[PDB]
Amino acid sequence: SARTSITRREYDEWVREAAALGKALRYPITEKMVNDSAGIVFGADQYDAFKNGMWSGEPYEAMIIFESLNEPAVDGLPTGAAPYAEYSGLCDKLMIVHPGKFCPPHHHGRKTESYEVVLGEMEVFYSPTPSAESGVELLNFSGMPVGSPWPEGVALPKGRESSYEKLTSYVRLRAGDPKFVMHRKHLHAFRCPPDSDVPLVVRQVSTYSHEPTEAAAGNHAPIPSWLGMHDNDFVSDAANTGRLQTAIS
Amino acid sequence: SARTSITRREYDEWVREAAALGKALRYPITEKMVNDSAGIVFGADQYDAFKNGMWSGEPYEAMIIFESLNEPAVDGLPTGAAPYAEYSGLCDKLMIVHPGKFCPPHHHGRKTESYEVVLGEMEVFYSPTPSAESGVELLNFSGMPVGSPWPEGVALPKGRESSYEKLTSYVRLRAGDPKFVMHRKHLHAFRCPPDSDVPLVVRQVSTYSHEPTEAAAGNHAPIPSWLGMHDNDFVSDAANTGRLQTAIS
Amino acid sequence: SARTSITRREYDEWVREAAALGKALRYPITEKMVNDSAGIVFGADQYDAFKNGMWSGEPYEAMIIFESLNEPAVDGLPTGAAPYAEYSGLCDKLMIVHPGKFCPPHHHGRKTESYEVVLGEMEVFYSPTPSAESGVELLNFSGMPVGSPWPEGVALPKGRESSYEKLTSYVRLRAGDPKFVMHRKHLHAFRCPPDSDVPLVVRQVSTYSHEPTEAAAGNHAPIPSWLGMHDNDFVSDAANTGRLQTAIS
Amino acid sequence: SARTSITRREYDEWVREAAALGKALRYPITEKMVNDSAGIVFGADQYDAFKNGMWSGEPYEAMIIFESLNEPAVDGLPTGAAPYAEYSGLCDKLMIVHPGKFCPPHHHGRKTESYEVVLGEMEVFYSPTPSAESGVELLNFSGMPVGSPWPEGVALPKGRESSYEKLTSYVRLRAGDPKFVMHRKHLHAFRCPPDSDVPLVVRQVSTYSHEPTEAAAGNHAPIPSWLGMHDNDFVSDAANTGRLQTAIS
């Protein structure tokens, strides 16, 4: 009785409620943002999240993301920055994670992120050590803070506990806290505490998001290389694929 | 009886109330953000705004900006992007403009902006035509939309009406609207309608903000060139100077 | 395949999401308010609402109510007001109605209500004519406004269309509108427009709510008569019973 | 240099900003609610609050109240309740108190109140002992909770420290807390902590408010006795008078 997809009703209810919560919190959600790509389930084995539901508190990798902005910011750029334009751009998204659920371990080669908790509390797991890129020298300025060790008793998704191994640092963010930056090339993940009375709602402001998603298929590329470019590297292979498409029955 | 500065009481009341409004609207304002650089008056001749006050509805160039993020995003960047890192980075700020007041005409060579109206309505004046940069070729992708002609009867600050000449396009933005992008190298300005019952509150998400302001004096530069770099070009000279410092008596 | 009850999962998800929406909107929801009495389905035949779900837009009589206050206000009252204390008291509740769903036709003999729309829009159907009370003279002051005729094409719950007959007046309320008063002894009902992108959220401030509900069973009576007193008279008999208990399987 | 009135500019700025804060917090404020009666200063000697301003943190008795509802609730009442209708009715108001400022000691003979903190924290001082009414027996049900002793170092308005003597009980309320009831015939007062970064915003839901204020002069009385009826008894005589009118120069 292992779920392999989500019913149209489960999907619509999940995403529509999330959009309303977003609107209540004053996030500018338009009609086109409420689509079949907003609700993400990272891998077939994660559809079991809808076995007991989004309020069961069980650890699964699934989340909602409403993207209000993903601007290349290529206009006005000297032609020389062309090869580096992919590290810039502006992206604004609202992320909604239910109790116990996770945005799984992954890293970006080009995208730097920042978090602003709007509702609930966010538990961020990450590697304070950045990854390297074979053959290319990289700049450094502030790097990432070390944070604290994980609190005791964190329930990880069954069959994916090892994917969190390297994300040794932990920080719990709350509404009103200073903005938190997740530099590119750093492994990161996050969840909404299982005992939370509300879904975790986080505003993410980042550089351009290269994600050839279902709702992405059908857009013009500002620069050749960008075409089909995927800037998401999930530690769990089963998470990289499902990331781009949601099975709705 | 022309004002040349703002009293400490006028300043504190202006900024503290604005911060509370910001908090009420869920913008993450920390203590360090509420300082003597938050309240901006663009030029000595604009201090007359406090002659009758921020609720008089008279046209003056003054505004409040609370910056929650100004991240260089240099970490993890290949060394080659060093000369172009200044066109990237992440900046999050809350802007508060009272009825009739303006954020004066200006343009940025490196910074691209985006607007999200949180409270009230925003009247944006801009040039759909970007400016050129002597000797350097520039990329183009989407450019700016033409918008509409100005509505009739817009009261401009006395003695600065000509600075708005080239900003022929107009767009009125409201809460819930799609994000609006102001590409770098485009002249832009905005005001809160004079008949508004509430101050205009706008969330600005942009690339790095190079502004050697009073609260800026005393920060490490991620890259040599960035040091003291000012990326703001106001059409009105009296606005470029006052931008960096507020006279509080 | 006609539903006769709601599953524990459907109930919890319905009420927990509603509570989060309420919190997002700053309504003071405590743990004890999130119980098995919050989600109301008016009659067995209305459980079919969960056949297609709360986002189907179909007309059914079901809603959520979180009560933050139900104060008798008997303390300090001269003993003579004892028999009339039941017409007073203070009650504060947040009401959440999904698209197309209704709070069914009913009237109160003692309770006067008021509505404040927090999210979405509220369509109120009511009788501008108050009902009489055999043998007892009644006071009059402002009475109810006539309002407008019903808009065309209002889909009513199947098998209960006649219960709306006498509620000839219509008013559509929005956030920011003046408070709307529903005087005692007036038939009233309301729904969230079927095409609404968000659940209707309304703050109700009224005199004491005499409702021997499931979560009510087990409270001290400030005055003898109040014990077990039910002040709700639904035009539809199938709505009076189900009002007090929700079948959760 | 003792203030005896508030300038039109000081008044408008005080009330207009407060209204905007209220709107930001989703309180339904209409145009007619933003008038010259909204800003209250309890006595000539309290105008010195505007000597240093509403953000000085000094102890003075002044506040803002926006009334969205004051419904007699007389309609549908059996004629016998006529003499007791004055203890009922519905009143909804938003109260805004700046740091260090107080709503001064007073009690109501007919009105029972309840508090819901929307922004900031509320420090309530009150007498757990109700006052008696010569010759008339009174009902009792729950009475008031004892609360805690006052915290140390509470700065009271100069020249009115004795008016707080009997208000021995203290409770600090926060957003999200259960509704707090202030029964009629109990002395009560409250302030916004002097170190608060935001004005205290509280939603008050109470029975009818008999207050022949400036904005009150010119309304029909639902019942004879109600005419000109004042249900506010301030311990400080200088507070009873100024309560009904604000001196605006």
Ligand SMILES: O=C(CO)[C@@H](O)[C@@H](O)CO
């Ligand atoms: O990509 C953009 C513009 O940045 C949006 O129109 C979409 O993400 C839909 O909101």
Ligand SMILES: O=C(CO)[C@@H](O)[C@@H](O)CO
């Ligand atoms: O990167 C993140 C969260 O770290 C989101 O913007 C999405 O890319 C997750 O798939």
Ligand SMILES: O=C(CO)[C@@H](O)[C@@H](O)CO
């Ligand atoms: O610059 C940063 C980090 O981006 C902030 O700490 C300051 O702007 C203060 O909010």
Ligand SMILES: O=C(CO)[C@@H](O)[C@@H](O)CO
């Ligand atoms: O650029 C803007 C508004 O266009 C702000 O971020 C400040 O730079 C205005 O001085």
Ligand SMILES: O=C(CO)[C@@H](O)[C@@H](O)CO
């Ligand atoms: O009844 C009261 C007090 O008025 C509340 O405690 C309950 O309704 C639970 O919120």
Ligand SMILES: O=C(CO)[C@@H](O)[C@@H](O)CO
């Ligand atoms: O009266 C109403 C809505 O008219 C609510 O407070 C509940 O009593 C509905 O059952």
Ligand SMILES: O=C(CO)[C@@H](O)[C@@H](O)CO
């Ligand atoms: O009194 C009433 C109705 O209760 C309101 O119209 C005024 O208080 C103005 O808001």
Ligand SMILES: O=C(CO)[C@@H](O)[C@@H](O)CO
């Ligand atoms: O009673 C209160 C606060 O206790 C308010 O509603 C006003 O009456 C204060 O003047």
Ligand SMILES: OC[C@@]1(O)OC[C@H](O)[C@@H]1O
């Ligand atoms: O609007 C889509 C939907 O939610 O409405 C009815 C059906 O259940 C489907 O899931």
Ligand SMILES: OC[C@@]1(O)OC[C@H](O)[C@@H]1O
């Ligand atoms: O594609 C639109 C839609 O069906 O997809 C998700 C959301 O429920 C919306 O109704």
Ligand SMILES: OC[C@@]1(O)OC[C@H](O)[C@@H]1O
């Ligand atoms: O609206 C946000 C989103 O779901 O829509 C497109 C993209 O896939 C992103 O995940």
Ligand SMILES: OC[C@@]1(O)OC[C@H](O)[C@@H]1O
């Ligand atoms: O030391 C390199 C590494 O193993 O440590 C952290 C980074 O993610 C990379 O995987």
Ligand SMILES: OC[C@@]1(O)OC[C@H](O)[C@@H]1O
């Ligand atoms: O106890 C925390 C931890 O060691 O356990 C699992 C995860 O790898 C994390 O590093």
Ligand SMILES: OC[C@@]1(O)OC[C@H](O)[C@@H]1O
């Ligand atoms: O806190 C600073 C201040 O507002 O408080 C008192 C004085 O008026 C000054 O302007």
Ligand SMILES: OC[C@@]1(O)OC[C@H](O)[C@@H]1O
């Ligand atoms: O520098 C801090 C401060 O005085 O500056 C502005 C704000 O009023 C705050 O009180």
Ligand SMILES: OC[C@@]1(O)OC[C@H](O)[C@@H]1O
């Ligand atoms: O808090 C925002 C701000 O006022 O502080 C620093 C910078 O000058 C910016 O204008």
